[PDB]
Structure formats: C-alpha cells, structure tokens
Amino acid sequence: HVEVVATITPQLSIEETLIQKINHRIDAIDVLELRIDQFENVTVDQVAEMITKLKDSFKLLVTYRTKLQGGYGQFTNDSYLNLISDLANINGIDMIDIEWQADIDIEKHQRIITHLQQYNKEVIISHHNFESTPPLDELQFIFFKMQKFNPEYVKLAVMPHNKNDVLNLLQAMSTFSDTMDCKVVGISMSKLGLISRTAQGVFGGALTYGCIGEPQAPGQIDVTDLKAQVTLY
Amino acid sequence: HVEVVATITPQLETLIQKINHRIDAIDVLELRIDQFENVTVDQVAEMITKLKDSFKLLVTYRTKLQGGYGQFTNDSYLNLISDLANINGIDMIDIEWQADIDIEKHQRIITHLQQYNKEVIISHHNFESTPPLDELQFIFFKMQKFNPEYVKLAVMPHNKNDVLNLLQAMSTFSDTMDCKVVGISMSKLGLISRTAQGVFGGALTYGCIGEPQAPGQIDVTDLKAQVTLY
C-alpha cells in the first residue's frame, strides 16, 4: 500500500488559497510534506507556528531540502543538522526528513536519528543524485548504508540516462523491499523515470510524491492524479 | 510510438458500436478467430469486410496450446495462416513460435506473408510462468531470426522480479535488434508492462473493449490514456 505525499512550500504566512486546495484533495493525501527550505533563516518556532495553522486526516512530514540536494536551503551543514534535531520538540510533527550523503559524520547522524525516534518521530533518510544513476550494486549499497541508521523510511532519488538506469532503480527498490525491515522509496527522475513514481507500489515502494498545483520535483503530478495512479496498480 | 491493440473475439453489431466508440484509442484491431469452429479464410474475409479505415487489422488464431481455443492440426493451422495472406483487408498476421517447430517451413511461411505485404507478428505465450531473464532473451533471439515485423512474448509473472525481467529482456532486445518487440507480463502484477510498454521499447500494447477475460486487461480507452502519459 503506497501512501501519497502532497508537497507544499508556503511562506511563513501559509496562504488561505492553499489551505483550501489542501482540504479539497483530502482524499488523495496520506502525508502532507511541509518543505521549509524556502525560508531564509527559518527557525523551529516559525515552523511550529505553521504546523498549528494546519492541525488530522494525514501525517505531517517536515522537510528542509538543502540546495546541495536540489532544494532552496542554504543553511550551513552545521545549522542544518541543528535545525533537524530541534524539530523533534514540535509535538505536531509526525515525520522528519534527514539527508544522507557519502561525506556525512556517521556517528553524529545516528545520534540525531535516535534523538528523533525517542521523540516518536518517524525518520525518512533521503539521498538525491541529479546527475546519474549508479550501477545496481552501487544503488543497493547506498540503500544498505542508509538503512544502517534504522530509520522508518529510506528514500533514494536518482537521474536516469537510459532505460536500464530506470530498471536498475526499480530493481534496487524491489530487492530491498523483499529483504530489509524498513520502508523504501525509490525514485528515478525526469519523464524517463515516470514509471517509478506511478507504479511505486508494484515494486515495493512506500511513498509517491505529488503537488497541489505545480511540480516540486522533476515535473510533478497533482496528488489527485497520483492517487488515481496508485489506485490503478 | 506504442500502438494500442484492441482484442475482439466475435461470432460470425453491439460490438461494432463499442469499437467505433473507442475508435480514437485503437491503432490496431486484433481479430482473434480461434474462437470459431472450423474457421475458413472465407469466413474470415466475410467478418473483416463487415468491420472495415483508421486502424490496422491484425488477425490472430491462438491455438489451445498457447492459451487460445484453436483446435487445429499444426498442419491445418500453418496452412490457415498461409492462406490468410490472400485477404487484402488484413494488415498483420500472428504466427506462433515454439522451439520444436519446423524452422524452414516457418521461414517459408513468414517470407510468403511478407511477399503479400503483411506485417508478421511472431509470438510466444506462457500463461503459467516467466522464464529467467537469460531464457527470455533466448526466446526473443530465436523468434528474431525469422526477420518478422514484430516479435511478441507474453509471460505470467509470479513475483516482481518476473515483471522486471520481462521489461529488461524487452528493453535490451529493443536496443540491439532490427525488428519491433512486444513484451507482456500478465496478471494485474504485470499491468505496468502494458501501460509503460513504450518506455521500454515496446511497439504494441493490448487492451479490451469492455469486458476482461482475466486480470491485467485494460479497456483500450483507459489504456490509451495511460500510454499517453509516458
């Protein structure tokens, strides 16, 4: 059973137009992802505010996507990890996204992830490669190192250059789905990789991301159409 | 691009209306005839004229062996297929393959059909399982040797790997071979193979007119809508 995620990226003052479009799609939204990287000097208090302006029909996921990994967040890596650790104190948050990459300080990441789970927050460790799709063995090894932190979800987004790249991503997710204990989200970007987002559930995937109006990732789809997709497979 | 196939199995007009309704989603109209007792190329011609100009006409005689109903000798079957080449209204003809067949007799029949300007779809179906990737590629290679217009392989997946294997086989073939390829992973588990057929090099995807004869079949109208997304 794939869950449909609706990504919003409001400004401190969460619109009234948006909150209404959200309620309209209540049936297609399992998880509401609140991106916050589009806020300069965003603070945990500001985020806490926005949350209340929302709260119970979907889980609330808060994501600060760094520019390094495709977002707007320019925070220092140090300030980034501090922000992620601080979001644990916001009672209304159900899921928190933490970025993974080769150069991370592993013991520090584990400390933060464990901290988050002690506050009963589901952790989504994610990795984004906008340049290419490593070979299958490499994809599986990335998934392996990420799940070592025992998160609730492991998320891998890669960029395809050919059909085999899409198939390898699907295979890596499918194989992971069959043997590992935590949930997996596999994303092959661009139109070439569309099948991974629509048939995410067929290959063991747990989440599929959509928008309410315009794409927040490689040509996004309205969650309503995405819900229809998940329902088709 | 991917051509959407609409499969029908009549019996020597309510259908005539349902097909015209979905006429915009139909690139090929597969006319299965194996559901008729003692089918003659003459009756086939009678039906075709009653149907037939916005889609190709594929005539398919699926033998019992390969999931159909056709109870013809291999001889009368191969002769039925050879004789279909005389019907001008037919654009494509489906000829079955299976490792034991007479290679030279088959090649003799395929070249024959192509002399009458018919597009040949050499096909193989396994309603029971999906062979390993290597074996899928083996099947494709054998069928490819006859230099047909299309090579078609339908398999029943048991698990996710079986679906990915079919897609992989079809994709790799797509990248090297000089003829069109068609891959089908049956059941709802394999639905993605029909909707994203063109993503992996497929040239034909099969749908229905309204009533499915099993799980995994999609109305050509919905199928066309899905194909259009990729």
Side-chain angles (χ1 to χ4, degrees):
Chain A
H1 178 290
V2 183
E3 294 203 295
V4 174
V5 183
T7 298
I8 61 178
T9 290
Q11 276 305 309
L12 282 303
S13 296
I14 168 62
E15 296 289 351
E16 182 45 277
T17 310
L18 180 46
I19 159 71
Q20 205 172 68
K21 294 182 185 299
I22 301 288
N23 296 173
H24 283 167
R25 298 168 179 57
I26 190 177
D27 174 285
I29 304 175
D30 295 300
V31 177
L32 174 66
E33 172 184 48
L34 176 67
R35 289 282 298 279
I36 64 180
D37 49 285
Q38 69 290 346
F39 291 173
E40 249 199 359
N41 308 302
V42 64
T43 67
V44 185
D45 302 71
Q46 301 174 305
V47 179
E49 285 183 53
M50 305 178 77
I51 272 57
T52 57
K53 211 285 186 176
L54 291 169
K55 300 180 68 59
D56 64 63
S57 298
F58 46 76
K59 301 158 69 172
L60 204 294
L61 158 66
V62 175
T63 301
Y64 179 99
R65 190 63 64 228
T66 67
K67 69 169 298 178
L68 198 301
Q69 292 196 34
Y72 297 121
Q74 297 201 305
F75 274 23
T76 279
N77 172 71
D78 225 294
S79 295
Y80 164 63
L81 300 182
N82 279 166
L83 176 59
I84 285 194
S85 191
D86 292 342
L87 291 167
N89 296 288
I90 301 182
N91 197 61
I93 304 308
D94 300 305
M95 311 156 71
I96 295 283
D97 181 295
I98 170 69
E99 296 181 353
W100 182 91
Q101 50 191 52
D103 61 46
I104 72 313
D105 170 349
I106 302 178
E107 286 186 354
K108 183 177 176 185
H109 250 52
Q110 183 62 72
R111 182 161 57 262
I112 300 171
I113 278 55
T114 288
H115 171 72
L116 301 180
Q117 303 176 316
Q118 277 178 55
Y119 271 88
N120 297 123
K121 305 308 178 186
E122 291 177 3
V123 182
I124 302 268
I125 306 185
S126 60
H127 185 249
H128 305 77
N129 189 323
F130 287 81
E131 267 65 17
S132 67
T133 301
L136 212 204
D137 283 348
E138 302 282 346
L139 294 183
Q140 173 180 167
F141 188 51
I142 291 303
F143 272 141
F144 173 78
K145 290 182 289 184
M146 291 193 291
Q147 65 82 49
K148 269 300 173 188
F149 297 99
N150 295 152
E152 269 68 31
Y153 296 81
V154 288
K155 178 192 166 187
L156 180 57
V158 292
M159 184 63 74
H161 290 194
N162 53 60
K163 299 176 295 174
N164 284 351
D165 281 341
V166 179
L167 285 174
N168 288 168
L169 177 279
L170 292 183
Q171 185 67 73
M173 159 176 54
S174 194
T175 294
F176 183 100
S177 166
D178 296 329
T179 64
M180 249 57 128
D181 259 65
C182 81
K183 298 176 178 175
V184 57
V185 179
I187 299 165
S188 177
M189 305 184 269
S190 81
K191 188 165 176 171
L192 218 195
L194 182 59
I195 180 279
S196 68
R197 300 166 174 285
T198 61
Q200 175 77 185
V202 180
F203 305 110
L207 263 35
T208 191
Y209 297 66
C211 64
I212 280 64
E214 215 51 53
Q216 210 71 189
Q220 281 204 311
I221 299 175
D222 182 64
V223 291
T224 296
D225 292 315
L226 207 55
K227 168 66 173 180
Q229 288 305 314
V230 173
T231 306
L232 179 59
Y233 301 103
Chain B
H1 224 299
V2 207
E3 288 197 289
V4 171
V5 181
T7 310
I8 62 175
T9 286
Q11 276 292 172
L12 300 307
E13 177 176 58
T14 219
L15 213 188
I16 299 289
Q17 227 164 56
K18 286 186 300 177
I19 62 86
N20 199 68
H21 179 190
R22 311 171 168 66
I23 195 172
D24 291 307
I26 302 169
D27 300 308
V28 172
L29 176 57
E30 179 184 49
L31 179 272
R32 282 280 288 277
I33 56 182
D34 56 284
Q35 73 279 10
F36 297 163
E37 49 287 292
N38 307 298
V39 304
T40 58
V41 183
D42 311 72
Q43 297 182 298
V44 170
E46 293 293 306
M47 305 192 88
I48 288 174
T49 58
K50 302 184 180 303
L51 304 176
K52 198 178 190 301
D53 56 67
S54 301
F55 54 76
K56 293 177 188 177
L57 181 63
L58 165 64
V59 171
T60 301
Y61 186 92
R62 192 66 62 219
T63 69
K64 177 74 62 54
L65 173 70
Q66 291 195 43
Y69 298 124
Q71 293 167 174
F72 274 18
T73 300
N74 170 66
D75 302 293
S76 62
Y77 162 69
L78 290 192
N79 264 281
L80 167 60
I81 279 190
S82 193
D83 295 343
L84 289 174
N86 291 301
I87 307 185
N88 284 26
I90 295 181
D91 297 298
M92 310 163 85
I93 306 172
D94 182 304
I95 179 178
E96 287 172 25
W97 179 90
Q98 51 195 63
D100 75 57
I101 80 305
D102 180 348
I103 304 177
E104 300 184 358
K105 180 182 182 186
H106 247 58
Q107 184 58 64
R108 177 178 181 175
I109 303 165
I110 292 179
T111 292
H112 168 68
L113 295 175
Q114 304 182 311
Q115 295 179 315
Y116 276 66
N117 282 188
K118 302 302 174 181
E119 295 184 1
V120 184
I121 300 72
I122 185 64
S123 72
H124 186 271
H125 315 70
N126 183 326
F127 290 72
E128 305 80 6
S129 59
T130 300
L133 174 59
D134 70 302
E135 280 310 282
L136 293 179
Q137 183 180 62
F138 184 78
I139 306 298
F140 270 144
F141 196 64
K142 287 282 188 171
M143 299 195 276
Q144 168 276 310
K145 294 293 191 175
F146 293 87
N147 279 169
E149 272 63 31
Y150 302 85
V151 44
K152 173 187 177 192
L153 178 63
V155 288
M156 178 58 78
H158 285 311
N159 51 64
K160 296 174 295 178
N161 287 347
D162 280 342
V163 179
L164 290 168
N165 282 167
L166 182 275
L167 297 177
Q168 183 67 78
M170 160 174 50
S171 193
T172 294
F173 184 92
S174 178
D175 308 323
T176 314
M177 304 303 99
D178 304 64
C179 75
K180 294 180 176 182
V181 62
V182 180
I184 295 175
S185 185
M186 305 182 243
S187 81
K188 190 176 179 186
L189 209 210
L191 183 59
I192 192 281
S193 73
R194 305 177 180 285
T195 56
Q197 179 70 189
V199 173
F200 298 106
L204 257 38
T205 189
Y206 298 65
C208 63
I209 193 60
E211 175 45 48
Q213 355 184 306
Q217 306 203 318
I218 169 87
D219 181 80
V220 291
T221 286
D222 302 320
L223 178 56
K224 169 77 70 168
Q226 293 312 300
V227 166
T228 302
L229 298 174
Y230 305 93

